[PDB]
Amino acid sequence: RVARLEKKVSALEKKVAXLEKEVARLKKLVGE
Amino acid sequence: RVARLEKKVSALEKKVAXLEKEVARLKKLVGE
Amino acid sequence: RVARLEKKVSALEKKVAXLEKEVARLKKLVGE
Numbered sequence: 001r002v003a004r005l006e007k008k009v010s011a012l013e014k015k016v017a018x019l020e021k022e023v024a025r026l027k028k029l030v031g032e
Numbered sequence: 033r034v035a036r037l038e039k040k041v042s043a044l045e046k047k048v049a050x051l052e053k054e055v056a057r058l059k060k061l062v063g064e
Numbered sequence: 065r066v067a068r069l070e071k072k073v074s075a076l077e078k079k080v081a082x083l084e085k086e087v088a089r090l091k092k093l094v095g096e
């Protein structure tokens with residue numbers, strides 16, 4: 001169960017890093 | 033401890049999935 | 065290993081909370 005969790009958490013880290021980059025780009029595209 | 037972590041990870045997966053879908057839709061609306 | 069996963073999951077939770085705030089703003093500006 002911990003080895004499986006480690007792999008799910010690594011997959012989440014890679015998806016969140018990306019979303020952060022895509023959201024940063026969208027924020028620039030949309031503007032203020 | 034591991035059961036509680038499994039619950040937290042499943043909740044994060046459900047939030048990341050969605051964010052991915054919302055981001056995809058926003059990308060289309062910006063012209064990518 | 066368990067403490068290391070708890071650290072990583074906490075970090076992810078605070079990055080996903082945010083992404084949800086910034087995606088909520090983008091969706092409001094583009095949608096309305």
Ligand SMILES: *C(=O)c1ccc(NC(C)=O)cc1
Pocket residue numbers: 001002003004005
């Ligand atoms: C949990 O991810 C976990 C628990 C047990 C094992 N392996 C064996 C042989 O029991 C892998 C992973």
Ligand SMILES: *C(=O)c1ccc(NC(C)=O)cc1
Pocket residue numbers: 033034035036037
């Ligand atoms: C951690 O989430 C954890 C550790 C032990 C137990 N024990 C039992 C018997 O349920 C639950 C959860």
Ligand SMILES: *C(=O)c1ccc(NC(C)=O)cc1
Pocket residue numbers: 046049050051053
């Ligand atoms: C889409 O945004 C999407 C589709 C399915 C799920 N599933 C669950 C269980 O939340 C999340 C998000």
Ligand SMILES: *C(=O)c1ccc(NC(C)=O)cc1
Pocket residue numbers: 065066067068069
């Ligand atoms: C897991 O994150 C983990 C496991 C063991 C230890 N330290 C000792 C002394 O057992 C730290 C962290």
Ligand SMILES: *C(=O)c1ccc(NC(C)=O)cc1
Pocket residue numbers: 081085
């Ligand atoms: C986001 O949910 C968030 C982040 C920081 C703060 N800070 C204060 C002091 O209210 C509120 C909400």
